[PDB]
Amino acid sequence: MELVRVTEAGAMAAGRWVGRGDKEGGDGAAVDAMRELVNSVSMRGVVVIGEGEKDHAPMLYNGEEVGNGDGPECDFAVDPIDGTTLMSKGMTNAISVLAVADRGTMFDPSAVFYMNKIAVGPDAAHVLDITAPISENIRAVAKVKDLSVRDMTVCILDRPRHAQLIHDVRATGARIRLITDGDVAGAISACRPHSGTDLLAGIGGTPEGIIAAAAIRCMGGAIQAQLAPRDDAERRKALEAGYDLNQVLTTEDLVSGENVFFCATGVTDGDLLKGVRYYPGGCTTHSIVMRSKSGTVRMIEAYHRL
Ligand SMILES: O=P(O)(O)OC[C@H]1O[C@](O)(COP(=O)(O)O)[C@@H](O)[C@@H]1O
Numbered sequence: 008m009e010l011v012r013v014t015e016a017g018a019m020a021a022g023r024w025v026g027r028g029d030k031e032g033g034d035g036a037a038v039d040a041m042r043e044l045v046n047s048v049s050m051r052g053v054v055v056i057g058e059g060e061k062d063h064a065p066m067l068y069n070g071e072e073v074g075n076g077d078g079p080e081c082d083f084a085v086d087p088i089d090g091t092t093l094m095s096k097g098m099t100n101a102i103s104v105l106a107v108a109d110r111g112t113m114f115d116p117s118a119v120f121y122m123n124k125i126a127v128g129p130d131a132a133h134v135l136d137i138t139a140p141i142s143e144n145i146r147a148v149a150k151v152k153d154l155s156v157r158d159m160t161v162c163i164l165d166r167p168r169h170a171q172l173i174h175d176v177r178a179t180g181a182r183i184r185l186i187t188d189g190d191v192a193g194a195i196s197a198c199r200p201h202s203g204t205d206l207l208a209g210i211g212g213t214p215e216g217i218i219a220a221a222a223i224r225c226m227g228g229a230i231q232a233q234l235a236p237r238d239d240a241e242r243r244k245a246l247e248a249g250y251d252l253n254q255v256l257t258t259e260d261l262v263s264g265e266n267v268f269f270c271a272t273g274v275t276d277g278d279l280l281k282g283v284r285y286y287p288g289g290c291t292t293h294s295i296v297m298r299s300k301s302g303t304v305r306m307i308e309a310y311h312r313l
């Protein structure tokens with residue numbers, strides 16, 4: 008069960024590219040570290056969600072059989088650096104995340120879409136309805152959490168596509184914690200108690216949403232998702248090919264295993280994880296590790312030497 012090391016390795020390599028302005032270098036260092044370390048853990052695993060396909064993205068592709076070959080079969084999802092932008096620009100909130108579940112329990116690869124997603128902590132889990140307007144979701148979650156609607160804090164990615172959403176949430180008088188990248192940590196923060204974030208809502212990336220669903224399954228809470236295309240061209244494509252885009256995906260629908268493992272390691276100083284500190288002896292790396300069987304969330308600061 009050497010899994011944590013992976014993300015830690017991912018951060019460590021990636022940590023040496025912070026502020027440097029090169030994004031591909033950080034992604035590549037993190038991917039190389041995580042690959043070289045995961046192919047050594049006694050674990051046969053298929054990457055259902057990763058960097059990409061077997062063409063331009065050479066490393067950490069979908070369908071890659073990772074591990075030394077031993078152990079039980081399992082679905083594997085990895086974001087080497089969530090918010091690579093923030094890594095290269097030397098800004099806060101950047102992590103290396105990894106989710107592991109039973110074989111076949113993670114959400115469909117299928118075709119490459121974005122994902123509209125809305126998540127809340129265990130408090131108001133059963134009252135989410137992603138098809139309802141954000142007004143009703145905010146009001147329901149507010150009453151359930153015993154909050155006034157003015158003190159609700161919705162986390163939304165600061166994009167042009169979400170502008171309307173912004174306005175709507177601002178109509179209910181609710182606060183919006185606009186972030187720039189990384190809705191995995193944002194969803195985990197929404198499902199974190201006393202974290203300031205009560206709810207996440209927005210159209211982010213499907214891999215991030217599936218890994219966040221694994222995390223939410225581990226720690227408790229609920230995320231609902233609808234697939235979404237980037238342009239009208241892909242909406243049309245989904246129409247000829249029979250994609251029920253109106254379909255709602257739950258937390259279990261994305262990751263439906265029984266043992267669910269989610270570990271992140273901070274690259275830069277994030278809200279839920281401190282970045283990698285380098286000193287001549289080695290480096291300190293902070294990580295979070297969550298298991299579904301036990302519900303024990305473990306926050307681990309690790310000291311490394313050479
Ligand atoms: O940045 P986009 O393309 O608008 O989509 C946002 C997605 O990018 C991410 O920030 C991923 O980080 P990177 O793109 O920097 O690798 C996700 O968290 C988020 O879902």
Ligand SMILES: [Mg+2]
Nearest residue numbers: 088089090091
């Ligand atoms: Mg990324």
